[PDB]
Structures are given as C-alpha cells and as structure tokens.
Write a protein that binds this DNA or RNA. Structure first.
Ligand SMILES: [K+]
Ligand SMILES: [K+]
Ligand SMILES: [K+]
Ligand SMILES: [Mg+2]
Ligand SMILES: [Mg+2]
Ligand SMILES: [Mg+2]
Ligand SMILES: [Mg+2]
Ligand SMILES: [Mg+2]
Ligand SMILES: [Mg+2]
Ligand SMILES: [Mg+2]
Ligand SMILES: [Mg+2]
Ligand SMILES: [Mg+2]
Ligand SMILES: [Mg+2]
Ligand SMILES: [Mg+2]
Ligand SMILES: [Mg+2]
Ligand SMILES: [Mg+2]
Ligand SMILES: [Mg+2]
Ligand SMILES: [Mg+2]
Ligand SMILES: [Mg+2]
Ligand SMILES: [Mg+2]
Ligand SMILES: [Mg+2]
Ligand SMILES: [Mg+2]
Ligand SMILES: [Mg+2]
Ligand SMILES: [Mg+2]
Ligand SMILES: [Mg+2]
Ligand SMILES: [Mg+2]
Ligand SMILES: [Mg+2]
Ligand SMILES: [Mg+2]
Ligand SMILES: [Mg+2]
Ligand SMILES: [Mg+2]
Ligand SMILES: [Mg+2]
Ligand SMILES: [Mg+2]
Ligand SMILES: [Mg+2]
Ligand SMILES: [Mg+2]
Ligand SMILES: [Mg+2]
Ligand SMILES: [Mg+2]
Ligand SMILES: [Mg+2]
Ligand SMILES: [Mg+2]
Ligand SMILES: [Mg+2]
Ligand SMILES: [Mg+2]
Ligand SMILES: [Mg+2]
Ligand SMILES: [Mg+2]
Ligand SMILES: [Mg+2]
Ligand SMILES: [Mg+2]
Ligand SMILES: [Mg+2]
Ligand SMILES: [Mg+2]
Ligand SMILES: [Mg+2]
Ligand SMILES: [Mg+2]
Ligand SMILES: [Mg+2]
Ligand SMILES: [Mg+2]
Ligand SMILES: [Mg+2]
Ligand SMILES: [Mg+2]
Ligand SMILES: [Mg+2]
Ligand SMILES: [Mg+2]
Ligand SMILES: [Mg+2]
Ligand SMILES: [Mg+2]
Ligand SMILES: [Mg+2]
Ligand SMILES: [Mg+2]
Ligand SMILES: [Mg+2]
Ligand SMILES: [Mg+2]
Ligand SMILES: [Mg+2]
Ligand SMILES: [Mg+2]
Ligand SMILES: [Mg+2]
Ligand SMILES: [Mg+2]
Ligand SMILES: [Mg+2]
Ligand SMILES: [Mg+2]
Ligand SMILES: [Mg+2]
Ligand SMILES: [Mg+2]
Ligand SMILES: [Mg+2]
Ligand SMILES: [Mg+2]
Ligand SMILES: [Mg+2]
Ligand SMILES: [Mg+2]
Ligand SMILES: [Mg+2]
Ligand SMILES: [Mg+2]
Ligand SMILES: [Mg+2]
Ligand SMILES: [Mg+2]
Ligand SMILES: [Mg+2]
Ligand SMILES: [Mg+2]
Ligand SMILES: [Mg+2]
Ligand SMILES: [Mg+2]
Ligand SMILES: [Mg+2]
Ligand SMILES: [Mg+2]
Ligand SMILES: [Mg+2]
Ligand SMILES: [Mg+2]
Ligand SMILES: [Mg+2]
Ligand SMILES: [Mg+2]
Ligand code: NA
Ligand code: NA
Ligand code: NA
Lengths: 121, 160
RNA sequence: AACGUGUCGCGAUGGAUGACUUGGCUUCCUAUUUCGUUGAAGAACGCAGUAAAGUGCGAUAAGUGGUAUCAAUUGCAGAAUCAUUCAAUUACCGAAUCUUUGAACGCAAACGGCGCAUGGGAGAAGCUCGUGUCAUCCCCGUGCAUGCCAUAUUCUCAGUGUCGA
RNA sequence: AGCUGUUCGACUUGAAAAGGGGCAACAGAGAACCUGGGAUUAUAUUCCAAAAAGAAAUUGCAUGUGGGA
RNA sequence: GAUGUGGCCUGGAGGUUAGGACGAAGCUUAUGGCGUGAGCCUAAGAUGGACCGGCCUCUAGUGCAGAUCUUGGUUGGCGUAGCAAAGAUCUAACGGAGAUAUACUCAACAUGCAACGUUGGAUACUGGAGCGGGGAAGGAUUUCGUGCCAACGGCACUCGUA
RNA sequence: UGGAAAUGGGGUGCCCCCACCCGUCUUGAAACACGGACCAAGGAGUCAAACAGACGCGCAAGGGAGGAGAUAUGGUUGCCAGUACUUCUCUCGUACUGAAAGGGAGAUGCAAAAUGCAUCUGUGGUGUGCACACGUCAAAUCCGUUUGAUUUGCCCAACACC
RNA sequence: AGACCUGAGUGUGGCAGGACUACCCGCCGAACUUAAGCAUAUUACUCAGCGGAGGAAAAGAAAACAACCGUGAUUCUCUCAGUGAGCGGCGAGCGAAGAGGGAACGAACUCGUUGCCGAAUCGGGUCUUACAAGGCCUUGAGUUGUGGCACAAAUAUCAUUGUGUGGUUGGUGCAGGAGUGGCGAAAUUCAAGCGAAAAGCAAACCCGUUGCUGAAUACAACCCUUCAUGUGAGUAUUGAGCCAAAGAAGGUGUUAGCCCAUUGAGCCAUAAACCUGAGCGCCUCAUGAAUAAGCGAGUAGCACUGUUUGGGAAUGCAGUGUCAAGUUGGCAGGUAUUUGUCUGCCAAAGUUAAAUACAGAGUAGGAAGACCGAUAGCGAACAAGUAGCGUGAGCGAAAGUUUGAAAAGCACUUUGGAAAGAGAGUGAAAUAGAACCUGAAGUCGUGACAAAGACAAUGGAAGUACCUCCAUUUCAAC
C-alpha cells in the first residue's frame, strides 16, 4: 500500500523521502465537527490561511491562522503560536498538523473540487 | 561469497616483528598494513561463512503428520488440556464447542462479535486483545513489531 | 617528614555498552524489459541571486515544453498573482535543448591546432550613391576515415583476356 | 569607334611528374623590434595614443602615380 | 581422554505468563542474600530515558587471559633522550594586550620574568663555481595588497610560502 | 523502640603461621626454555553429501519418497514459499549364488524313483537356557503367605555341536 | 566501331567497428592441489586469455532408441546411478545412456535434388489516399536459372461458373476490453489534571451496571530547624462509547482500530501495440472447397599422428595422406576380422515457440526474511570507489551530524587582548551547550581517611583493631 506495507524499512523510507506533493497529504488535519457535518469530510490537508486550533501538546487550546506549511520540517506555522528568544524577539513554533484541528477552511476553486470529490454522501 | 576477502592481502613473513597474518597492501591509508582475511581480523571474513544450501526444510512421514493432527484434535476435546494451554474457557457451554451453521450468513463484524459473546468465546478473544504489545528485542526492528496470544480457532465447513 | 601505597566520594581523559536504523546481505515474483555512426558507455569543462563538494542539468545549463496536481520553495533573499489557467510546487511523459571529446570517422595532437569542397555572416580598405557592394583578414553550418553491400534515367574507364568489325 | 593578326592574365585538350598519409627537436634547422618612461601593490623587447616617448622592420590585400604589356 | 547433568550463560523463533513514565535496556557498587560452582536475585544511584523479565519448546555467526592474535584507545619510560654542521648578534626608538602588572610594610634593587615586528645606528657573514640576477624539468597561485594568529612554521613571533 | 542491643556479611590495617610466575612443548619448568605493558570490542570443530553404530518416533513383509499435479487457493498487500490431497511409477527390502551361460532354498511320513509318492496346526535334531505350569525341600512368618533351592514339562531370546 | 569477361574511379542509398558480458555459444588453456614421494592420472576438457549473441542462448523434426505386446523432434526434472555399466600407476580417483513417473507442447516447416513449366522472378521509376505481396513501365539484374506445381500428414492440376474466406496484402476508420495514469471509504483527540486515587482491592466464573479506600501527613545525602526549588508532551491508567467486507505492520512530543496517512467497491482519461464470432464496415488484392525419375562428394569412410571421452582392438574431433557406394545402396545395432540373416533409420543444406540458465549483468517495478545491526552487514548507513598512496598496472580508508519535543542554540552584567571564566537566562532535563543520547573499562587529578620501615607486590588460613549509606533478629518476666 501507500507508504505503509509489510516492510517497516520500506514504509519509513517512503515517508521520510516523500516528495512535496506526497507530503501535502501526509500533513493533513481533521476538520471541526461543524465542518465535518457541513462537508461530510473527515480531514483535509492543511494549507496557508487556514484557521486551526491546537488539540495536543503544550499549546493545546490555542487558536490562530496557518502562516506556513513548511513541509520540509513536517510542521505548520500558526500566527498565534510563538515564543520569545533570548534577545527578546518573537519566533514561531512548529506544530505537526495531526495535533491540530481545522476550524475555518480557506476556500478556492481547487479546494472546492477536493471537498466535492471527497464528499461521503 | 566475496565478503571480507576483497583485498590483495599477503602475509609479511617472519623477519618483521609482527604476527604472520595477511596484511592489506599499499600505503597512504589507515587500512594499509592492517590484518586481513582472518576471522579474528577487523574487516576480515567470518569463520565458516553461511551458505544458501543449508538444510532449511524437513521431510516428515505422511502417516506421522496425520498422527500429530489426530493427537492434537483429541487433546482439544479435553477441557483441562485446553485450560492448561492458557485459554479462558471457563464460561463456554461445552467442549468440544459446536455451534449452528447460521454463522456463515453473517455479513457485519458487529453480528460476529455478538455471536462470540453468546457462546462465551469473547473471554479468550479479550485475553488476546490485552496481550498485544511491542515485541522485545531485535525482532521489532524486522517486520515482527507486535506480538499477541493465539485465541480461539473457529472451524468452518468450507471457504465461505 | 617527603616520595610512594591502599580505600572511598567527586572530577578529567577515553568513546565501549544499550536503545535507535532512509544501510547491507539473502530469497522470490511481474514485463509490448536490453545501448551505439540518428554518435553509445566512459572521460573533461561549465551551469544557481547567493553555491566548495555532492546532486541535477548543458550556453534554452539545480533547467525549456506537455499532462496531471493545487499553494509553495525555504539558510537568506527575490517573486505578477494569491491564484480556472496563462508563472507556485511536486509527480510523470509524448515536444525540445543537449559545450569539448570518446568506436571517433577530413588531417593531427602535452597544439582548445591545420585543411579541401559547398552554404552563409560580419566587414571603419577600396570602388559606388551616411546608403549599397566588398579584396585581404575573421566567425559559423554541412560534407569529407577505412572496409563491405547495393546501385548508376543505365555514369567514366583499363587489360599482347575472349571475340567481333 | 569597329576588322584581321598578336602579348599577358581569367574559362573551357594532356606533354611529364615512379616510389600512399602522418607524427617525432620549447638547446639541431627556422624566426620581421628595440631603446626611453614618473608604466604596477603585483606584468611588460607584451602596457604608453597624436608631439602615440618614440624610431623601425616585415607579411596579405588593395588604390593612385611612374614605366612596360 | 570419554560421558552425564528438570546444570549455568548469550542473540533470535513458536507458545505461555508478566513488568515499564509512580521509570525499560544499559551502566556504577565496602548492596547484601542465595548456590559447591557456572551464575541468579534484591537494594541504592544524589545513573539513565523506552522498552523488557520468567517458564516450555525451537534455533544459532552462543561464553576468552595469552595465538611475536586484529582494530581503537591508554600507558611507565618522561618533563627524560634530546632540539650542538652551515661563525652573530648588540643598541635606542616606535608598534603591540603581550607592562615599569604588588594585601600590609615599603624610596628605588632584593616581588611581572622571558620573549616579538619595523626603522635608524653598530658589528659581522655570503665573497661573482654567492643565503646575487634570470631560465628548463618539476611544482601550480606558493606572486601582490589588506586583515588576521585557532591549528601549522619540532623554540618563538605582533612575522609567514599559515 | 533508640544515631540501639545483638548475630551474620562487607572494607581496611596488623600479628603468628603457610605460600616460587602464568600459559605452553617436554621424562623433567619457578627456570639462565618460548609467548606474556593495560583496557575495550572482535577471535577459532562449522555447513553440505556418503556410510555405519547407539538412542527417539511411525509403519511393518512391507517402508518411503522424489519430481509433479490437482484444489481449499481461479483466493488473499500479507498470513499462504505453509498446511490439506494424489500417484498401475521409482527406490530400499521380502533370496541368494556363479566369471558367465544359467540355476535357485519347508516339515513329517512311506520309501530309495538321475524332477519318487502321501499329508499340511507347524519349533529339522541335540546340549545349555527367562517366564509359566505341576510338584518337592529349606528358612522366616503378623500363619494370609514370601524367599531361596530343586524335580518334571514346555522351553521364549540367545550360545554351542550337527 | 562495338560486345562481354575480368578489374578499377566516382556519385547515390545503406551496413560494420565501440560498450555490456551474470547466464549462453566457439576457440585457447595452467598450475597450486590429491595421489601421504612423483612422471600417467587428478585438480579440469576448470582459472586466466581471445572471439560472438540474446532476453535467454544453444539444441531441435531421426542416417534416433531399442530387441519389446515395442517407443517416436528438441530442452528440462525425479529416477536410472556414485552404478555387481564402465575408465583408471585397475592406485588415488573418475563415471554416463535407453527404459519409467513428469514439465512443456495447436509443432512443425524451407531449400537443393528428380519430374512438369519456364522470367510467370527481383530491384528501380510511376499511379491508385499506398517506398501495396496491386496495375503500368523498365535491360537495369537475372537463362552460368529467379520463381511456380507435385513428392508418404501424398495421390493429379488448370482453366470456367457460382459458393465464401483472409483484420498476417495494402489503403481507409469504427468499437469493447485489458494495460497504464489520476481520483476515490468508517469510527473518541470522549470524561477524570497532575509529587501522593489519571491509583487500587473484593483472590477460576458470577456477584460487579456493585461494595470497599489512602502506611506518598512523600523525597531531596551526617541530623536539627528555618527558608526556597522541583514534576515536558497523555500512543499510559480508569470510566463510558463507537467502526470493522477496513485490527494493516507507517507517521504524530510516551505503548493509537476511532489524531493523520493507509486498507474497498467504484469513477475519469487514453499515440501506437496487445486481447475480443481468427472484434466489426468500405475499397483494393489474394485465396480454399465442390509416370516415370531422383533425393546434398575431397563428403562419409580408411591409415598415421594428436587430443577428448565412462566408451574399453579406438566416444567425438583436428591435421596430413588416401578417398567411396548408390544393380535389395548406405549408416547404426558399445570385442577386432571375413561371411549371411534380422531390426531401425536415410548423413554430408537451412528455419523454428515453450518447458531450462541468469554462479560478481542491466531497465521498469513489486513481495519478503527464525539474516547483520555501525570493529557487524557490501569496501562504502556519511560530498565512497571518495580522501589518500603508487611512474604505472593497481591499491584504497576512517567517518551514525544520535542536542533537544521544539533552537527555545545561552540576550544581558562583570573580568579578560582574545580564548574563556564568573553570574544571569531557555529548557522537564545543560552532568542535553553543537560532532552535544547513554557515557563502560583502563589511566589520571582532587578531598577525606587507613596506615605503612627495609621481607617486590599479590595470595592462603585463622584471629584481632577500627569502620560499615548492608542484611537479619530482639526489645518483658519477652
Ligand atoms: K545437582
Ligand atoms: K593496539
Ligand atoms: K578432463
Ligand atoms: Mg479516513
Ligand atoms: Mg566483513
Ligand atoms: Mg502489557
Ligand atoms: Mg535486548
Ligand atoms: Mg555527441
Ligand atoms: Mg580526429
Ligand atoms: Mg583516426
Ligand atoms: Mg582489347
Ligand atoms: Mg613535427
Ligand atoms: Mg623542454
Ligand atoms: Mg632553436
Ligand atoms: Mg618567434
Ligand atoms: Mg616580477
Ligand atoms: Mg546471530
Ligand atoms: Mg515472553
Ligand atoms: Mg559506593
Ligand atoms: Mg571497590
Ligand atoms: Mg535468564
Ligand atoms: Mg564465534
Ligand atoms: Mg576482552
Ligand atoms: Mg603479543
Ligand atoms: Mg607520561
Ligand atoms: Mg635534558
Ligand atoms: Mg645531537
Ligand atoms: Mg649553527
Ligand atoms: Mg635593529
Ligand atoms: Mg620591581
Ligand atoms: Mg619586562
Ligand atoms: Mg668574509
Ligand atoms: Mg670564509
Ligand atoms: Mg671573482
Ligand atoms: Mg647564485
Ligand atoms: Mg608573499
Ligand atoms: Mg613552534
Ligand atoms: Mg616462608
Ligand atoms: Mg620445548
Ligand atoms: Mg629437553
Ligand atoms: Mg611452567
Ligand atoms: Mg637455569
Ligand atoms: Mg619454540
Ligand atoms: Mg510426496
Ligand atoms: Mg538379503
Ligand atoms: Mg544373476
Ligand atoms: Mg585448491
Ligand atoms: Mg603429492
Ligand atoms: Mg603431503
Ligand atoms: Mg611436491
Ligand atoms: Mg573465463
Ligand atoms: Mg523462456
Ligand atoms: Mg535460437
Ligand atoms: Mg525423444
Ligand atoms: Mg541404489
Ligand atoms: Mg574428468
Ligand atoms: Mg518419458
Ligand atoms: Mg524423462
Ligand atoms: Mg510498383
Ligand atoms: Mg529453384
Ligand atoms: Mg490527545
Ligand atoms: Mg478529552
Ligand atoms: Mg499520572
Ligand atoms: Mg504529564
Ligand atoms: Mg497526532
Ligand atoms: Mg501506531
Ligand atoms: Mg484500494
Ligand atoms: Mg473475423
Ligand atoms: Mg540424403
Ligand atoms: Mg575426407
Ligand atoms: Mg582426460
Ligand atoms: Mg581416441
Ligand atoms: Mg585417434
Ligand atoms: Mg538452429
Ligand atoms: Mg512470507
Ligand atoms: Mg566506530
Ligand atoms: Mg563498515
Ligand atoms: Mg570497512
Ligand atoms: Mg526553569
Ligand atoms: Mg547525566
Ligand atoms: Mg542527557
Ligand atoms: Mg553525552
Ligand atoms: Mg573510566
Ligand atoms: Mg580517587
Ligand atoms: Mg613476598
Ligand atoms: Mg581482617
Ligand atoms: Na642545546
Ligand atoms: Na486491413
Ligand atoms: Na482502444
């Protein structure tokens, strides 16, 4: 199957050497219960300008807008999720997408096509 | 077949105050003059390298194979032997446990799971579920990550 | 006394051990699966805004085109749009590009050298009315190894070969 | 200005020329430049610009003049 | 030398039964207990941070003190042998963090030593078959300026073919 | 009921007694015989085939493949390269001898036919020989017996003569 | 003059050369070694060397086995068989074949020759939508012979006419599928918050959808106060649910069916090729059915030599010499010869799929493992055939970047020329501070203590002095 298979070595290699477009599907987050009922879709790949809330980790319960999907460090950047450096400047903190939940969807013509074909009804 | 022997690696002789072992030729490298070809040398060939024409498989007499299956079946009808093997059969109605043919009509796992509770086979199933864990040792690095107990065996008349 | 000895607590030097494993080794299977003068394999130079190596690519040079896919890449920077597309990025592939070489084959070679044909190009001298044209010089393309096969709107020849006029 | 004949260069009949194509010398053979500079942080018989600091020597094409054809 | 051992130990497999973030493996020990022993187990870590124990069976690259054994590291010798051909340096000033660097006492010596580069003087050497000025082979940026002193120039450097 | 009283264990020193350096070759090593500075990790009877004996297991005058096929499986990423099923075959034995041509093994009875007849519940015979069955003695008995020896019959497995 | 024979030049259109080489085909070809020496033998018709192909190659349609009630191209497998074959200083050793059970198999075809024809043939122009298996033209080639028909799976063939076949004649264009590519499934981030109940006990099962409840008033180094500081992230536990034709093994800050990705029906798009009443139309072109003769010549044999073979008075082959038969001929029938009977087959020309190999190959993908786990496993887990070495042929490493969940990678103060130190901060943890997890042994420094002559030190056995973060026992007439 895709990535996961009978070989742990092959499955892990397929994950950590994934191309950019494969990484997008791996960096997906669940939709909120409001969005799940509206679109009949369990989860969507996170993109920029999405609104998410952290559900797992130290920043659990923090809401903000996705400012970057790094896809090389396997994290997303949220505007309200940050911390202070030694010198006093603010730097963003990366969060794995599977630890957050999408509350608002950035809707494009391409994004509607994905939601339409992923509709379970 | 070539592992540990991919060198020129001639011995130096007795005149030089070193052990008489083949040594890697050349110079300009940390491996030059190093011991070679020996099972006791770093980077050398293992003692008695393993071969693929080892006897992996076995012949068993056809009658002896049927004797074993017959003995295993007779043991499965003894409740004390089943308990001694580790199965939780303390609530099943009868041993051997025979059930009606209608289970082959089930289509949903929900129906099959309800049947296992009726004949009290779910206790042995639950024993397997609680025993699932990561395998201890190197085998988890291979494709043997999870281990569990056996549980009940359901025998059907055919492949349906 | 001092050196020195022994034990314990704590440090240093030194990188074993355990856990970890995108690597190796071994076995098995599936195919409209087998390179090159239509210039291969190999070798050499070069190419990024920033770029030594490596990777990818060839003066269209970390890539052009086309299909999908749908918002990145990312050290920094830059970037029309925030994206049906025409410019994100990945994946794949039909269209292209593909420097010097190398069987290397115009002749050579510790020479980025020197030819013969035939097409071009640039030409501030000269002639012509800054425009034309252009000698010498210079630049670029194509052909030009040897052997063999076939062939010639039935091409040009040689022989005190055999004839026939 | 034409005609005949004629000299010499360009375009289209065939004397005589035996012995294929190339490499091998940065000390042999060959080879038209040499002074001055205030011209550099580092190159120079290699750079210097109209008073070339300047003075030459040599090839390849041409034009005009002089003289032959 | 033979044989036996519900004899010990190690990496994996089929079973079974357990443990671990209230801390797995590994490691440490004047931590004791058990066993004739191989070893097993507990305690503590002011260690560690994620796996793993017992028992039955199966299996194998399964147990080290020495092979002038292999590889890595360490080590007494030892601040020891030495760093002695090519004669040689001295002085002031400038530069430099490299100084004239100080509890008390205390005028300076007896409490910051020794070492650098440049320039000017002094002294000396090479002595034209030269530590002179140019080339071939070989090397290929060592050339030049500025900056710099972690490593390197077996002493040193503020200097350098670093 | 305590920074405790005991006993055991552990650590260090001391006293009196003992006490040649390990591994190796060798008749003989503490040797003026060789290998031996320290530690870590690595390091050497293995896999395959033929035969034999012991032991385990199945079947037995028969045992067993192998190759292959069939279908549960024409299925499933995988489990499933396993398991289940089959063979007028092949092989090792039930028979051995001879260089070969070629022959090829029961007993009893009756009898002596250069292929003799009859019968088929039968160790070819003899000696020594477990158990068992008839007794017969001895000792001891809790008086039920046991525990030794021996006679006779049959003698199993074996051994020895034929 | 010219021809045609032989041989040249040039133009036009093409092909060869090199790479790869695991397996395969042809040649060439050792020795170490074994024989307890060694020469025949063996290693071995092997390594090295030189050539040549392909997805396989080679072999292949009987001049074959057999001796039977007969089998029937080739290849491969079990077996025949380590052989009562055979070869062999008959030593060491070596060593097959037929039959039988199977795999595969639509498996068969072409030329030469002989008869009967005879340029009906081939190229090259040109036209038909066409370098047509077509028409027309063509001296160009070919009569020193290209093609046609018939030769045991056979028994006429050649015109006619109707019957109807070829999707492998060539044009033209029309479907479905397979194959590829993309897309495409469920269910808790549910409830309980923190050093100590986000823990347990009611001892098969049930009771239990219930009852019961804290020996952590914790611990932080001689102990006694007092004052501070300390618990990262819930894939853990407990309780309550849910999905499963999906429990499948990857990811995510601890161990996840329900956080993410996967795991299925199905949908969409397609150069050619492939499969489908030899898929289905049209034009064109092809095409089926209702008397004698021969059969492969420096070849086969034979002789000598050499080699190879289990092949032994010679199993194949090579060189030279010599060299047939075809008037019941020839070859084989595993002891040489000469006879005569029998059996099988018909050499000296060619093509051919599968079953088989891939023993150091490649392309595009996949599936795995009782394997190794950074001195192991490929030399290479990493800018590895790299750095480096050698004139060269060649030789050839060491190296896990494994900090942390996240860089949050130590601002700022102070001493120092700097390197750094001392503080202060981040972080659950800097003794996690950048070749940064764990951090052993050996060696060394330091503080404390034990002592100790010179008996080298270590060791054994018994005591003793002092210590002991060790264990166990006892603490009332016990
Ligand atoms: K014992
Ligand atoms: K060493
Ligand atoms: K041979
Ligand atoms: Mg889903
Ligand atoms: Mg190795
Ligand atoms: Mg568990
Ligand atoms: Mg382990
Ligand atoms: Mg090229
Ligand atoms: Mg050339
Ligand atoms: Mg050439
Ligand atoms: Mg003539
Ligand atoms: Mg020359
Ligand atoms: Mg020279
Ligand atoms: Mg000269
Ligand atoms: Mg010159
Ligand atoms: Mg100079
Ligand atoms: Mg192992
Ligand atoms: Mg276990
Ligand atoms: Mg201690
Ligand atoms: Mg100790
Ligand atoms: Mg154990
Ligand atoms: Mg070993
Ligand atoms: Mg060791
Ligand atoms: Mg040694
Ligand atoms: Mg020292
Ligand atoms: Mg000294
Ligand atoms: Mg000296
Ligand atoms: Mg001197
Ligand atoms: Mg001076
Ligand atoms: Mg002073
Ligand atoms: Mg001073
Ligand atoms: Mg002098
Ligand atoms: Mg002198
Ligand atoms: Mg002089
Ligand atoms: Mg000189
Ligand atoms: Mg310099
Ligand atoms: Mg120095
Ligand atoms: Mg004594
Ligand atoms: Mg000796
Ligand atoms: Mg002696
Ligand atoms: Mg000794
Ligand atoms: Mg002596
Ligand atoms: Mg000796
Ligand atoms: Mg079988
Ligand atoms: Mg017998
Ligand atoms: Mg016989
Ligand atoms: Mg050998
Ligand atoms: Mg020998
Ligand atoms: Mg010998
Ligand atoms: Mg010898
Ligand atoms: Mg070879
Ligand atoms: Mg094939
Ligand atoms: Mg072939
Ligand atoms: Mg046959
Ligand atoms: Mg046999
Ligand atoms: Mg042989
Ligand atoms: Mg057969
Ligand atoms: Mg066969
Ligand atoms: Mg035509
Ligand atoms: Mg013919
Ligand atoms: Mg959560
Ligand atoms: Mg919750
Ligand atoms: Mg908790
Ligand atoms: Mg927590
Ligand atoms: Mg998650
Ligand atoms: Mg998981
Ligand atoms: Mg699917
Ligand atoms: Mg049809
Ligand atoms: Mg013939
Ligand atoms: Mg002949
Ligand atoms: Mg031979
Ligand atoms: Mg012979
Ligand atoms: Mg011969
Ligand atoms: Mg052939
Ligand atoms: Mg498997
Ligand atoms: Mg290492
Ligand atoms: Mg390695
Ligand atoms: Mg290595
Ligand atoms: Mg803090
Ligand atoms: Mg630590
Ligand atoms: Mg740490
Ligand atoms: Mg560390
Ligand atoms: Mg240490
Ligand atoms: Mg100490
Ligand atoms: Mg002593
Ligand atoms: Mg004592
Ligand atoms: Na000195
Ligand atoms: Na057609
Ligand atoms: Na199609």
């Amino acid at each position: 199957a895709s990535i996961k298979c009978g070989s742990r070595r092959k499955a892990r290699r397929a994950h950590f050497q994934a191309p950019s477009h494969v990484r997008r599907v791996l960096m997906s987050a669940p939709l909120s219960k409001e969005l799940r009922a509206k679109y009949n879709v369990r989860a969507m790949p996170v993109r920029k300008d999405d609104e998410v809330i952290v559900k797992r980790g130290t920043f659990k319960g923090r809401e903000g807008k996705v400012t970057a999907c790094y896809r090389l460090k396997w994290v997303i950047l949220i505007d309200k999720v940050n911390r202070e450096k030694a010198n006093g400047s603010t730097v963003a903190v990366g969060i794995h997408p599977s630890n957050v939940e999408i509350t608002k969807l950035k809707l494009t013509h391409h994004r509607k096509s994905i939601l339409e074909r992923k509709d379970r009804s | 077949r070539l592992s540990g022997m991919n060198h020129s690696a001639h011995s130096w002789g007795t005149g030089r105050a070193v052990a008489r072992i083949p040594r890697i030729s050349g110079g300009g490298t940390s491996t030059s003059g190093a011991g070679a070809f020996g099972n006791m040398c770093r980077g050398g060939r293992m003692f008695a390298p393993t071969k693929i024409f080892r006897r992996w498989h076995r012949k068993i007499n056809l009658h002896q194979k049927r004797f074993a299956v017959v003995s295993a079946l007779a043991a499965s009808s003894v409740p004390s032997l089943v308990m001694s093997r580790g199965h939780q059969i303390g609530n099943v109605p009868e041993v051997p446990l025979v059930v009606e043919d209608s289970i082959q009509g089930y289509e949903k796992t929900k129906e099959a799971m309800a049947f296992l509770k009726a004949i009290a086979a779910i206790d042995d199933v639950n024993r397997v579920n609680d025993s699932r864990e990561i395998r201890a040792g190197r085998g988890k690095m291979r494709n043997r990550r999870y281990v569990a107990r056996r549980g009940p065996m359901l025998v059907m008349p055919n492949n349906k």
